[PDB]
Ligand binder design. Structure first.
Ligand SMILES: [Mg+2]
Ligand SMILES: [Zn+2]
Ligand SMILES: [Zn+2]
Lengths: 114, 801, 62, 31
RNA sequence: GUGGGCCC
RNA sequence: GGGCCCA
């Protein structure tokens, strides 16, 4: 009975999810508003201990990740680590208008909140 | 010269006639009969207000909503000039109501400025009737997002965005604000929370107001709504609400804030539910899409690629040996397995950018569904059970996490009729959104796109299959009908169908035509009315609230669900899911909806034969002035159609024997109206270059389901024979998607399947069109060396048994 | 010889795929653009030009 | 896919265009 | 992945 | 059960 098989699988799934759910922020913001109901657009927006910016080029990474820290729509972030659309490490130094055409122009830029 | 008027003569078209020299009427008039090249006042009132420069239209594709999407700019330029007149029109309804003046309204008095004068046939006394006003200027209101004003603080264009708080959901007050701001005098109802709607007719009504009343508010507002919950102690959080941009608020009325010994089905609810997967992972953002984004599942972005065509060189030699693929020969080779890189996924997902909401111009849909009723009064549906479905094709996917473990076979076999029907019962109270996966295709073809495909979770479709699958099957085998689903061509069935579609079309000629980019430009409202229409047969097994909650649970299942493009969370403004159970039938319905629109705004902006004139006049005073579901004008029109404009259909393939007279008068269908329409109703241009018009019924159709047609002899008299394009079979035999790679067992079926396709070339004058067949014969015999081997049956397939 | 060398381009880009060009992104982008243009052939001089371009890179590697 | 390389070789040898054949000769020297 | 004809 | 064509 593969019914019970997928059942076992999905219970293990939905149980193992809680390894990063009990944040104590969740309660801190359910107890803000009435009747325990708000959208899902903003739930992992504001439980956010991470932010990944996937850009196309150099023109974007400049106007987006200016420096090694920035703000993301009125909230602050620290640039930790960057790669370049095929997962070879880059630097802010290497990322310049000079050596633009040795990039896989898009960049995955993981920054961390303060 | 010609000023376009709504006359009340009863209709709307051109008439030779401090202010503006053009009016808002002239504006919407050129909006709504776009004859490309003859598209004048459209541009005139664009350039009149610095909305776009004419020199920009020297570029190609300016009037494509599919290439050059900058016209978003050109049109959102005029948004406040729209809005201002709407508000003017409510305050004008005021200044009539308290002025005691009861006469019906029209826009020709209304300036591009917005304001008003000239009160001439008005009775002095109220209720000044707008209904023509909005029944005119309804669908063109998302065409600019004219009510972008209200999103600023103090609803002023020159301001920051209102930061609405990032937890709220309701806004019903604000929904009514925009209503009675714009619809104070709206003499018919409103239920922006549409569980309050009167019936399905009022569902279409009011959710077609949540469209306009949801352009303006932000993405933070909408989507599923989440609460903390506790089984066996520990907390979870779950979307136990949903806010549709069309259906407003909905609260799962069957909730369990506390639980214990949760169920199989309840995990079927809570497994594919969104937030469990969403808030239980990281964040993501890519500048690739114009789409809003939310999240990532895994913390690495992903890419996938194509493995290009095989090649079949034995047959290549076997052909070109006999002088195939020769110089000057129309035996060239055209069709091949393209291959595509990793940017494919996001670079067609982007083409959802061309989506935009509609205002289905409501009374017209309402009457058109008053029409389609009798296309299906010949047919019958109703709710059914797990154990009386004719399901096939069950070895297939079942949803996002449900990808990971099994096939739909398991879910039809595991979820008992008890299970699936209890689900059927819960779902007609509540709303459970789920996940869609966008994938790509390996179709040998000619052009260089990819045409993404969709797959949804089995929870959705299993309900949907229990729901509609009696009406379909009433039509899957109703032959002699309009439709042909299930109706093959074979055994000369195509022939008698052609004779049937003809059956006294008067001044008969054939026309045919096809849709560019329906699966992306699909206005969601039409999908709404279809899935409603597809349920009027439930009148012994569904109550009206259950109808509303059906409708909503499907509109969250597949239409505005959340999209996983890679490992990247988004939402979908719309666009059909090509893997849906009801794709072709819903799109058939879509096709007739377009058909009648053609009929009507043929017959509206176009009359001497008073059969015709009374038919359009009682159209006018069925729609512009009346409401009721009436069978008599209905059947007048309906048999008028079936006599004079008689049709057959497959999902976009709209074959039409029709009257040149009426078509040459402005009663019935010609391509131009459709072009205009989807340019003002489905967000696309339909170029007649891909359409065709055969003016000789003796010579069969140029196109249908990848087939042309001719006229030959059959058993002492002449008949129409369909016939395919040789290049297709050439490519598909010469290029394989790793099929003959496995064994030579199956590919016997491959080539012979391809081989029957084109025996009619044997009947056609050109020689090598024939030796297409003779090649295939000799190849088939070349294979029967190792192993119909001849043309024995391949002729008896056009001698009906 | 336009049909035949279109078939040539196809097998060429196939074997090109067989040896992991996709891993180096823009390499794959170039070759893909070349072939998607090669199958559109009307004047054969351009077809031969694009052929020799697509050949230069197979030749570049070992 | 071993025959793929061989049949493309014979394919090019049939194409019989000067530039392609000269560069095949260039390639036979690993150059 | 959808439903539809065909054939094995 | 397998697969061609078609929306
Ligand atoms: Mg067609
Ligand atoms: Zn209502
Ligand atoms: Zn029912």
């Amino acid at each position: 009975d593969k019914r019970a098989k997928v059942t076992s699988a999905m219970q293990t799934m939905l149980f193992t999810m809680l390894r990063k759910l009990d944040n104590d922020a969740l309660n801190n913001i359910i107890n803000n508003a009435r009747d325990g109901c708000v959208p899902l657009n903003i739930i992992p927006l504001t439980t956010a201990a991470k932010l990944m910016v996937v850009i196309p080029d150099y023109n974007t990474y400049k106007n987006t990740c200016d420096g090694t820290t920035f703000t993301y729509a009125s909230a602050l972030w620290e640039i930790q680590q960057v790669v370049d659309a095929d997962s070879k490490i880059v630097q802010l130094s290497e990322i310049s208008m000079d050596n633009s055409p040795n990039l896989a122009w898009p960049l995955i830029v993981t920054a961390l909140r303060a | 010269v010609y000023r376009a008027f709504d006359i009340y003569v009863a209709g709307f078209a051109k008439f030779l006639k401090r202010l503006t020299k053009y009016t808002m009427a002239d504006l919407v008039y050129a909006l709504r009969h776009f004859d490309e090249g003859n598209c004048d006042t459209l541009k005139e009132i664009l350039v009149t207000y610095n909305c776009c420069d004419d020199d920009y239209f020297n570029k190609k594709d300016w009037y494509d909503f599919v290439e050059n999407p900058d016209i978003l700019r050109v049109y959102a330029n005029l948004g406040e000039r729209v809005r201002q007149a709407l508000l003017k029109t409510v305050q004008f309804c005021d200044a009539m109501r308290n002025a005691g003046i009861v006469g019906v309204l029209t826009l020709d008095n209304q300036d591009l400025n917005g304001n008003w004068y000239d009160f001439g046939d008005f009775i002095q006394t109220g209720v000044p009737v707008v209904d023509s006003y909005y029944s005119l200027l309804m669908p063109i209101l998302t065409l600019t997002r004219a009510l972008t004003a209200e999103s600023h603080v103090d609803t002023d264009l020159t301001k920051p965005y209102i930061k609405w708080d990032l937890l709220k959901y309701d806004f019903t007050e604000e929904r009514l604000k925009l209503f009675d701001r714009y619809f104070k005098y709206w003499d018919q109802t409103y239920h922006p929370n549409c569980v309050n709607c009167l019936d399905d007719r009022c569902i279409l009504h009011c959710a077609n107001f949540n469209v306009l009343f949801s352009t303006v508010f932000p993405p933070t507002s909408f989507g599923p709504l989440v609460r903390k919950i506790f089984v066996d102690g520990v907390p979870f959080v779950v979307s136990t609400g949903y806010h549709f941009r069309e259906l407003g608020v909905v609260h799962n009325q069957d909730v369990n804030l506390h639980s214990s010994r949760l169920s199989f089905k309840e995990l079927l609810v809570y497994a594919a539910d969104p937030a469990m997967h969403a808030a239980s992972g990281n964040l993501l953002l890519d500048k690739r899409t114009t789409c809003f984004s939310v999240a990532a599942l895994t913390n690495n972005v992903a890419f996938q690629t194509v493995k290009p065509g095989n090649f079949n060189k034995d047959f290549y030699d076997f052909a070109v040996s006999k002088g195939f693929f020769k110089e000057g020969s129309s035996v060239e080779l055209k069709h091949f397995f393209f291959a595509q890189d990793g940017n494919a996924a996001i670079s067609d997902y982007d083409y959802y950018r061309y989506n935009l909401p509609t205002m289905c111009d409501i009374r017209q849909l309402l009457f058109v569904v008053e029409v389609v009723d009798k296309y299906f009064d010949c047919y019958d549906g109703g709710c059914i059970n797990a154990n009386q479905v004719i399901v096939n094709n069950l070895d297939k996917s079942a949803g996002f996490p449900f990808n990971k473990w099994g096939k739909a076979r398991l879910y039809y076999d595991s979820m008992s009729y008890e299970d699936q029907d209890a689900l059927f019962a819960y779902t007609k109270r509540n709303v459970i959104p789920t996940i869609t996966q966008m994938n790509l295709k390996y179709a040998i073809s000619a052009k260089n796109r990819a045409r993404t495909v969709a797959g949804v979770s089995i929870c959705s479709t299993m309900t949907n299959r229990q729901f509609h699958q009696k009406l379909l099957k009433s039509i899957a085998a109703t032959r002699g009908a309009t439709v042909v689903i299930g109706t093959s061509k074979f055994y000369g069935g195509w022939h008698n169908m052609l004779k049937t579609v003809y059956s006294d079309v008067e001044n008969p000629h054939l026309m045919g035509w096809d849709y560019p980019k329906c699966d992306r430009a699909m206005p969601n409202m039409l999908r709404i009315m279809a899935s409603l229409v597809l349920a009027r047969k439930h009148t012994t097994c569904c109550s009206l609230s259950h109808r509303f909650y059906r409708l909503a649970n499907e509109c969250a299942q597949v239409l505005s669900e959340m999209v996983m493009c890679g490992g990247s969370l988004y939402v979908k403004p719309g666009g059909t899911s090509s893997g849906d159970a009801t794709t072709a039938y819903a799109n058939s319905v879509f096709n007739i909806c377009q058909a009648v629109t053609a009929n009507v705004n043929a017959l509206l902006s176009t009359i001497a034969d008073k059969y015709v004139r009374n038919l359009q006049h009682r159209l006018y005073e069925c729609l512009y002035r009346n409401r009721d579901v009436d069978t008599d004008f209905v059947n007048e029109f309906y048999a008028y159609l079936r006599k004079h404009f008689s049709m057959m259909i497959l999902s976009d393939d709209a074959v039409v024997c029709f009257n040149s007279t009426y078509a040459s008068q402005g009663l019935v269908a010609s391509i131009k109206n459709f072009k205009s329409v989807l340019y003002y109703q489905n967000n696309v241009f339909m170029s007649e270059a891909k359409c065709w018009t055969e003016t000789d019924l003796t010579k069969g159709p140029h196109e249908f389901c990848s087939q042309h047609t001719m006229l030959v002899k059959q058993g002492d008299d002449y008949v129409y024979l369909p016939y395919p394009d040789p290049s297709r079979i050439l490519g598909a035999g010469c290029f394989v998607d790793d099929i003959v790679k496995t064994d030579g067992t199956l590919m016997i079926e491959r080539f012979v399947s391809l081989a029957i396709d084109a025996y009619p070339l044997t009947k056609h004058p050109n020689q090598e069109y024939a030796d297409v067949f003779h090649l295939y014969l000799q190849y088939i015999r070349k294979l029967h060396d190792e192993l119909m081997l001849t043309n024995d049956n391949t002729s008896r397939y056009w001698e009906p048994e | 010889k336009m049909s035949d060398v279109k078939c040539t381009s196809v097998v060429l880009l196939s074997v090109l795929q067989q040896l992991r060009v996709e891993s180096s992104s823009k390499l794959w982008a170039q070759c893909v653009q070349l072939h998607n243009d090669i199958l559109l052939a009307k004047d054969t001089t351009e077809a031969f030009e694009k052929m020799v371009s697509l050949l230069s890179v197979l030749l570049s590697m070992q | 896919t071993s025959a793929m390389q061989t049949m493309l070789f014979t394919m090019l040898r049939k194409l019989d265009n000067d530039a392609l054949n000269n560069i095949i000769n260039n390639a036979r020297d690993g150059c």
